[PDB]
Amino acid sequence: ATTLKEAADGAGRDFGFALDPNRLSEAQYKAIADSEFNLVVAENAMKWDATEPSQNSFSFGAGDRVASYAADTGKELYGHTLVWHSQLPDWAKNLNGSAFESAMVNHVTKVADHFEGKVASWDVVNEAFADGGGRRQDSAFQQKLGNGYIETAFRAARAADPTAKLCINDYNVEGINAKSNSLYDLVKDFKARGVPLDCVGFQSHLIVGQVPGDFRQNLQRFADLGVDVRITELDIRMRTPSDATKLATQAADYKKVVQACMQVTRCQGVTVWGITDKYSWVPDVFPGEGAALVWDASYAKKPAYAAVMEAFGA
Numbered sequence: 531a532t533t534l535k536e537a538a539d540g541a542g543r544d545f546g547f548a549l550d551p552n553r554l555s556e557a558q559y560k561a562i563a564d565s566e567f568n569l570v571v572a573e574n575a576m577k578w579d580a581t582e583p584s585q586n587s588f589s590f591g592a593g594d595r596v597a598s599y600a601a602d603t604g605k606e607l608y609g610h611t612l613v614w615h616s617q618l619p620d621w622a623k624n625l626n627g628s629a630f631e632s633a634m635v636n637h638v639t640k641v642a643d644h645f646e647g648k649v650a651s652w653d654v655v656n657e658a659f660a661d662g663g664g665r666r667q668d669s670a671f672q673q674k675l676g677n678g679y680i681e682t683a684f685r686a687a688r689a690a691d692p693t694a695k696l697c698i699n700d701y702n703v704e705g706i707n708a709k710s711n712s713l714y715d716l717v718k719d720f721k722a723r724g725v726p727l728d729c730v731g732f733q734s735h736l737i738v739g740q741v742p743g744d745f746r747q748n749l750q751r752f753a754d755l756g757v758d759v760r761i762t763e764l765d766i767r768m769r770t771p772s773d774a775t776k777l778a779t780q781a782a783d784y785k786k787v788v789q790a791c792m793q794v795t796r797c798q799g800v801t802v803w804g805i806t807d808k809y810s811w812v813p814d815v816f817p818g819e820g821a822a823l824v825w826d827a828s829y830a831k832k833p834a835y836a837a838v839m840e841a842f843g844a
């Protein structure tokens with residue numbers, strides 16, 4: 531292989547990226563998107579704020595643009611995300627009880643129906659758990675609906691889309707810890723009772739030099755529950771500006787993550803959360819941090835590029 535797409539294709543695995551469809555008009559961005567990935571996810575275009583800005587009024591143009599991009603380029607389409615506490619519109623926050631449950635169900639149903647037969651997998655529920663174990667403590671869904679909302683969401687998604695792979699997704703669940711144990715318990719429970727659930731997403735927003743050593747073992751125990759696994763939002767952030775040492779450690783870190791996936795038969799692949807450092811979410815959330823992606827802000831390949839190629843087997 532000479533490209534990351536070629537390495538992943540050759541390995542029989544997915545290598546995806548988070549797309550902002552507005553950046554498609556930047557030709558260098560499009561060139562890399564077209565040639566370097568075999569899967570695409572909408573970074574923002576399929577979230578609740580982006581799809582249902584007022585109650586039962588849907589805006590699918592941006593998500594459709596991502597879907598059409600996937601179909602036109604022959605890439606697998608991954609859906610993100612039906613239920614997530616973050617950036618939920620105020621109209622939804624203002625609802626309670628059965629009115630809120632109904633809005634959630636209607637959102638799942640309408641969005642899943644709209645993209646049916648295009649989106650191959652959904653993050654049905656995103657970030658349900660708390661660092662340190664148990665349920666997230668700042669979620670409208672948890673607060674208004676309690677424990678059962680996850681099962682409700684998965685069943686509604688299956689009702690709408692009989693075949694799509696239905697995933698639950700989270701961060702800080704890459705190692706074996708209280709948070710991933712809570713997640714593991716739910717997955718095992720869902721599979722034991724026949725709640726629709728096919729996959730688990732490991733966001734893998736990691737810090738340079740700190741890839742969990744038990745990542746493979748964790749991915750494997752999940753796969754062994756009878757579900758697929760995926761690295762969904764990989765980036766590996768460092769203190770800026772980058773230097774040779776940090777770039778080398780970052781490359782080694784990318785290799786470790788991709789290798790952990792390669793080493794688990796039901797790991798579908800790895801999706802990186804963007805193309806270029808120019809557009810990464812990291813600097814705005816974490817001041818003084820960044821340079822987390824495979825291409826720098828001028829779209830030059832970083833040492834992480836070779837490391838990803840090598841890990842997929844090339």
Ligand SMILES: OC[C@H]1CNC[C@@H](O)[C@@H]1O[C@@H]1O[C@H](CO)[C@@H](O[C@@H]2O[C@H](CO)[C@@H](O)[C@H](O)[C@H]2O)[C@H](O)[C@H]1O
Pocket residue numbers: 573574577616617656733763809810811814
């Ligand atoms: O925060 C990183 C990721 C955590 N896992 C779930 C993902 O959904 C999440 O992605 C981020 O989700 C954020 C919230 O939806 C995104 O922030 C958005 O993107 C912008 C800057 O990146 C801002 O203009 C803006 O207010 C906001 O719409 C950001 O792009 C995007 O990368």
